[PDB]
TrEMBL record, chain E:
<feature type="binding site">
    <location>
        <position position="82"/>
    </location>
    <ligand>
        <name>chlorophyll a 13</name>
    </ligand>
</feature>
<feature type="binding site">
    <location>
        <position position="74"/>
    </location>
    <ligand>
        <name>chlorophyll a 4</name>
    </ligand>
</feature>
<comment type="similarity">
    <text>Belongs to the PsaA/PsaB family.</text>
</comment>
<feature type="binding site">
    <location>
        <position position="50"/>
    </location>
    <ligand>
        <name>chlorophyll a 10</name>
    </ligand>
</feature>
<feature type="binding site">
    <location>
        <position position="91"/>
    </location>
    <ligand>
        <name>chlorophyll a 14</name>
    </ligand>
</feature>
<feature type="binding site">
    <location>
        <position position="11"/>
    </location>
    <ligand>
        <name>chlorophyll a 9</name>
    </ligand>
</feature>
<feature type="binding site">
    <location>
        <position position="16"/>
    </location>
    <ligand>
        <name>chlorophyll a 9</name>
    </ligand>
</feature>
<comment type="function">
    <text>PsaA and PsaB bind P700, the primary electron donor of photosystem I (PSI), as well as the electron acceptors A0, A1 and FX. PSI is a cytochrome c6-ferredoxin oxidoreductase, converting photonic excitation into a charge separation, which transfers an electron from the donor P700 chlorophyll pair to the spectroscopically characterized acceptors A0, A1, FX, FA and FB in turn. Oxidized P700 is reduced on the lumenal side of the thylakoid membrane by cytochrome c6.</text>
</comment>
<feature type="binding site">
    <location>
        <position position="8"/>
    </location>
    <ligand>
        <name>chlorophyll a 9</name>
    </ligand>
</feature>
<feature type="binding site">
    <location>
        <position position="92"/>
    </location>
    <ligand>
        <name>chlorophyll a 13</name>
    </ligand>
</feature>
<feature type="binding site">
    <location>
        <position position="88"/>
    </location>
    <ligand>
        <name>chlorophyll a 13</name>
    </ligand>
</feature>
<feature type="transmembrane region" description="Helical">
    <location>
        <begin position="49"/>
        <end position="73"/>
    </location>
</feature>
<feature type="binding site">
    <location>
        <position position="72"/>
    </location>
    <ligand>
        <name>chlorophyll a 12</name>
    </ligand>
</feature>
<protein>
    <recommendedName>
        <fullName>Photosystem I P700 chlorophyll a apoprotein A1</fullName>
    </recommendedName>
</protein>
<feature type="binding site">
    <location>
        <position position="34"/>
    </location>
    <ligand>
        <name>chlorophyll a 7</name>
    </ligand>
</feature>
<comment type="subunit">
    <text>The PsaA/B heterodimer binds the P700 chlorophyll special pair and subsequent electron acceptors. PSI consists of a core antenna complex that captures photons, and an electron transfer chain that converts photonic excitation into a charge separation. The eukaryotic PSI reaction center is composed of at least 11 subunits.</text>
</comment>
<feature type="binding site">
    <location>
        <position position="93"/>
    </location>
    <ligand>
        <name>chlorophyll a 6</name>
    </ligand>
</feature>
Amino acid sequence: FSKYLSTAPVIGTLTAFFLAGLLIEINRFNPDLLVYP
Amino acid sequence: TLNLNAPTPIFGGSTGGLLRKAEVEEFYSITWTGKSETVFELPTGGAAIMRAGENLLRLARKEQCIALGAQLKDKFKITDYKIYRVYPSGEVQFLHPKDGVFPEKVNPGRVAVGSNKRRIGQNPDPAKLKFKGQETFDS
Amino acid sequence: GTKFPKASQALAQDPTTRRIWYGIATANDFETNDGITEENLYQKIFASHFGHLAIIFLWTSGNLFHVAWQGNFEQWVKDPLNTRPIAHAISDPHFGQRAIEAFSQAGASSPVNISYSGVYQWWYTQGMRTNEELYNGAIFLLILSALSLFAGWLHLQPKFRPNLSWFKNAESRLNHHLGGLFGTSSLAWTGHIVHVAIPESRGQHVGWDNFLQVAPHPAGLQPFFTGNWGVYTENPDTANHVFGSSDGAGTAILTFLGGFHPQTQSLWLTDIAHHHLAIAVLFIVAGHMYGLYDTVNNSLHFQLGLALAALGVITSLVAQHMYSIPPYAYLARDFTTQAALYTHHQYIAGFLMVGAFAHGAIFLVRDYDAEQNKNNVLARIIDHKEAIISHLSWVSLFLGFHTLGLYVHNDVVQAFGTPEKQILIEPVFAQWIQSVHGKSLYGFEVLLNNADSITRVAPGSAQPIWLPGWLDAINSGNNSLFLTIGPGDFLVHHAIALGLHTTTLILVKGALDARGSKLMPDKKDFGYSFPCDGPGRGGTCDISAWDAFYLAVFWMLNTIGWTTFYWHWKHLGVWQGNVAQFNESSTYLMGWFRDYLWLNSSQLINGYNPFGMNNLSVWAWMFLFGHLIWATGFMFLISWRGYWQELIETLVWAHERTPLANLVRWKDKPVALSIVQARLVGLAHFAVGYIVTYAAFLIASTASKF
Amino acid sequence: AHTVKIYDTCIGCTQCVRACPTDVLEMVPWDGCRANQIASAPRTEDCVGCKRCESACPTDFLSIRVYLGAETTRSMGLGY
Amino acid sequence: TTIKPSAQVVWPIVGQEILNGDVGGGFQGIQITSGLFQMWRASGITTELQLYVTAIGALVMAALMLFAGWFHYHKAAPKLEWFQNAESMMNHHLGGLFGLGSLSWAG
Amino acid sequence: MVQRGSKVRILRKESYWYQEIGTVASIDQSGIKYPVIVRFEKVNYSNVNSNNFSLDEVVEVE
Amino acid sequence: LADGQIFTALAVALVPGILALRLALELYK
Amino acid sequence: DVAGLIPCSQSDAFERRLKNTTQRLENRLKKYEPGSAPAEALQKQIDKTQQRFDKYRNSGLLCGADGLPHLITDGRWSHAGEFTIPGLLFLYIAGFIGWSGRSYLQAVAASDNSTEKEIIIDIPVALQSVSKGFVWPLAALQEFSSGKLTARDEEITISPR
Amino acid sequence: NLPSILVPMVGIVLPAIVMALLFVYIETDE
Ligand code: CLA
Ligand code: CLA
Ligand code: CLA
Ligand code: CLA
Ligand SMILES: CC1=C(/C=C/C(C)=C/C=C/C(C)=C\C=C\C=C(C)\C=C\C=C(C)\C=C\C2=C(C)CCCC2(C)C)C(C)(C)CCC1
Ligand code: SF4
């Protein structure tokens, strides 16, 4: 099953789930970031 | 020869077969011996029943006679089918096998028609053969 | 079998319907005719050109004749601001009584069409005032067409057939065309302006009946030879001057005022005269001057592709400069024909530019001889062809991902009630150029905005006198001379850039892979246009160079569409003096959908309805007409040959087996359209529909509100 | 009719010949070795241009090539 | 009549919490057009405790179907002739699935 | 002279593996034209890994 | 315009009408 | 003031974007109970607008006639935070994704079955490549200077000319 | 007045003539 997790769709989804949820948490605590202050 | 007439299989049907092209120019006939009384699909619709025969079927195109002739060698293993093309309103008798041997098998006595003594990258430019009667692919 | 088509015996032996279609398509493709020698080929081209010229002459004779006979030119000349120019009368028997009362407009007693070609404003400036001067133009062009038609027939006769060497005598042609065709014609056009155009603009009538008596300048032609050229820059027309009368009229014939006449909101006639005289001199001097260049000379497709590219570039130029620098009196005031003129010439330019690359690809498959073309610019571009295409691919992707991304970003952020979160980039490089040209709005204050800068002062010879007239117009908010731009203009300009790069990409990849690719190494052996290479090797649909042009026609329309969509919406606010609508709504796409398409289609879509009909019923019908033929093209583009060929077979069967119909027979066997044919037929429907839909909307939306 | 040319890179695999739906091709004795076989096109007047032959050729870039030409009743595949 | 049928409360992030509109009463969410509110009222459901156990009852039915799919392929797979019994399958779905399903729902 | 198992680079411009590296499967020991059978790691559009070339279309990159 | 100027213009247009037919049947041959 | 743009702290239109936004929500708060759950949902929504606008005044953004923040990309160092500072922030992350997958495919191709290792991701080899991806502006410079960043055009597959 | 005569000639009559002229020209043969 850990060999199955290295296959491209499931390893391509959970990092797409991770890279999304990074930006979801960043925009949650730090809202409305147009520019670098 | 064609052995016309020969018994057409017990079919009775097919709107999709042998219209006015056949009576003006160039229809086709395929003649085989079926060593059973089995049902077989046609190029038009599907059934007839193969006779013991001397079986014969008049078709519209040479395409349909080989497409039926491939079926008799695949499903029923009868490889003695003999396609033809008719007299006065047709053109040339005994289309296949032209040398008596199936074309996938080599036979001595045949001549190489349409051969090119090069590759395709060695073919000249079309600008080199502009305004001439020569063709870019012909040798 | 049959005689038609004459040009191709192999089509002539085809017993099916394909023969007629292909015989129409392969007809003016003279190169592929039977037995056509090089010498015979060129003479046919030349003669075909005379026929085309005559048609052009007859066309503009037909516009003159119909205006003089059924227009309102004489009524228009009296008050250009309020008179609607009439194109021609309407004679459509299918009209009813209420429809005749709706199209009996512009003060006419018959149904007529309001003209939008701008011919009234062009003919006026040249000096025409009455219908009888218009009619005199129509008869003269009839003769010139008959002079063109006779000449084509003449240069086909044995004793007058030009030799092959004459057609390929390149150096002689450049000298004579730049000198004669361009130079002396421009010089002659300067003659018309100082002797007719300028006098008629000052209330003095000059025609053929008196031009040899009256002088264009009080004491002209003694200062010209004695070198005192400065006398022609005497007292110009005052700002009070009313075009077409002697009140405030001057006597200058060659000037350098700059800017636009304050009343007509267009260039000064005297200013246009000096321009052509100068241009004339440039061409006459350049006309006394006269490997890669030999392969230009032996290929008619190479020349045509460059001539299409040269025409395509300057066709766009005509559109850009006519809306911002109006050259015809009262053309800036009629907003609908200014909308029509920009759109018309921009679409033509898109076709020419796409066509330029099309004939370039034809050259590479049929005329490019790779053995006689080594180590030059041509054979070097093919050598790193994959680099060029890959980079063109990158820029398209780069531009596209980000411009669409910002639009989608803005759309979401505006949809959620937070417009302040949008990403709006100011067009600072552009706004710099406007300040370089003199627009003092952004305050960048360098070159022609800086009052002490060398470009405005010019201490070498004290030249800079074009500056007063130019600066007044570019700073007054009453024209289109360097319109104010903002965030909306930034995004669209990159969308247009995206369109120009992607359209060029399709055309460049198609041309550079025309001779061959890995999927089809011997592509050149099959010619410019062929169906494909079968389902083998993975599949080969749309592999011919012709198909690449075909895909690029979709991208150019999209590109020219985004161009024309932008120009129209921006000017719409500008013409209504409420620029705020475009500036704030154009930065997100819902604004282009709600405030541009939906908003301006209110009246157009109501051209006729259950309560009546107005003077927009034609445009409303055409609008629907365009949608139907656009959509009809999708049928040929999505459904392919096989479905149809098998369907047609059941129809052949059905016809032959039905009594009273069996009795009659087709001479040509019915068959489905070809693979290449369908692409062409689908694209032709699509693109006719694309243009006809936008033309109906553009004209009706602007004419409704002005 | 369509023209079907056979180039000298043929390895006598017979795949093209056995792909043709109208029996346009056959194997004939080669004289370059008197051992192997090359494809031939003696009945091109019956070629419909389906290109099934080329799709069966194993060689990296075709030894048999079909260049579509003048169409006829036979070449258009009409039963009418 | 006045209160619009709504579910799917949207999280307070970048601005999609404007989708939680004034839908009726003291609630903010997405007005649904699925007919579930009129279907549960016809079924008789008056409290969310009855909606809760039906969500639990659907999850155990999901696991029962997922266990039956594992069991009837990996562990206990029927033969071909068990599938070709069309007359018994027509008998059972008409009486059991369609008859008792509409009998007990009438109950 | 190219032996079996040697790495070559293809000079045939119409090939899919033109200017690419492949290894020889075998050499036919007769006078048959194009005897050099090269096997490649990349497949072409017909998904085949082998082709026949001549000695003039292969080199001795090694 | 006048009514006689119209029929004058259709009288002139036969000269391109014949010379187009003279050119097009010459371009055909 | 680079294109006629007043700053957003002095823009009178940017203040009126605040006034109608909180008026559209205080009218949306007028119908609810003061202690309810949609009451604190709109009060947290109102205070998100107050942290939106007071962030944009002090950031030094440029507001036009409509009252929206504009970005000035000609890059000046007074306006570097609009495009220049997030531009260098993008390129490192984008080059880290680029140099990882490029070095991953070079490590995979010199193996037995490189084709299956594009389906299955070798977690040792992938974590070896993200170690090589953090140093991409230093690693690509020595890869280019030593000459193994590029191939010559006689080693690449190329169409017939 | 002349509009009422001419627009059914080139609208109906003259296309009926040239379609008749082109159709016999297509289906002639040697
Ligand atoms: C029932 C549908 C219908 C029909 C048959 C017509 C017919 C006509 N209308 Mg129209 N019209 C209609 C609906 C219709 N209308 C509707 C619903 C409206 C909105 C209310 C209008 C509004 C309107 C306006 C404003 C005008 C017309 C005019 C005309 C006339 C054009 C005369 C002409 O020069 O044709 C010749 C046709 C052409 C030159 C275009 C055809 C080009 C072909 C198809 C392209 C292919 C060429 C190719 C080589 C094919 C071979 C051809 C060859 C065999 C001859 C013609 C009588 C005009 C008029 O009055 O003229 C006197 C005009 O100004 N109509
Ligand atoms: C003056 C410039 C010029 C010249 C001399 C030529 C000349 C030629 N072109 Mg080129 N070309 C040009 C510009 C030019 N073209 C432009 C602007 C484009 C982009 C559109 C192209 C794109 C192009 C391609 C792709 C091809 C050519 C080809 C040709 C050759 C044969 C044309 C032919 O017989 O088609 C027959 C003519 C037709 C089929 C015309 C019917 C289609 C029209 C558009 C229908 C119009 C629709 C309808 C009437 C509208 C009615 C309105 C509606 C509301 C009812 C000939 C050498 C062909 C060739 O093979 O060259 C060797 C070829 O494949 N051209
Ligand atoms: C493709 C997927 C799909 C989805 C997501 C939906 C979604 C929905 N359906 Mg629909 N449905 C679908 C396909 C789908 N339907 C198809 C193909 C049919 C025809 C068989 C139906 C027949 C149907 C009915 C009769 C009803 C719904 C209802 C609903 C809504 C409430 C959900 C619910 O649990 O009701 C649960 C279902 C019911 C309460 C009614 C079930 C009664 C039927 C007659 C039982 C039939 C079962 C039987 C095995 C199927 C016939 C087999 C026969 C041909 C041999 C929801 C919007 C309900 C609705 O409108 O809500 C307001 C509703 O009454 N659907
Ligand atoms: C562009 C050229 C053109 C012109 C000038 C017209 C003109 C007319 N059409 Mg239209 N029509 C056209 C193209 C044209 N059509 C096209 C392309 C279509 C297909 C979209 C139509 C579809 C259409 C329909 C369905 C109808 C018309 C009708 C009419 C007539 C309405 C008024 C009327 O009935 O007078 C009253 C006068 C008469 C009824 C008699 C007039 C003369 C008749 C037609 C011929 C008399 C025989 C004559 C001796 C010899 C025949 C002439 C022929 C050989 C050239 C009007 C004459 C209507 C009509 O009445 O049809 C006849 C009608 O119902 N049209
Ligand atoms: C600054 C600035 C600017 C400008 C810009 C510019 C102008 C630029 C240019 C640029 C350019 C003109 C560039 C060029 C380039 C080229 C080349 C040639 C490249 C190459 C590359 C490479 C080779 C890559 C590699 C890689 C890496 C590194 C990593 C990842 C992976 C890869 C592989 C991708 C602006 C104004 C906007 C803004 C402000 C700032
Ligand atoms: S028939 Fe269609 S799918 Fe087949 S090769 Fe031709 S274009 Fe491609």
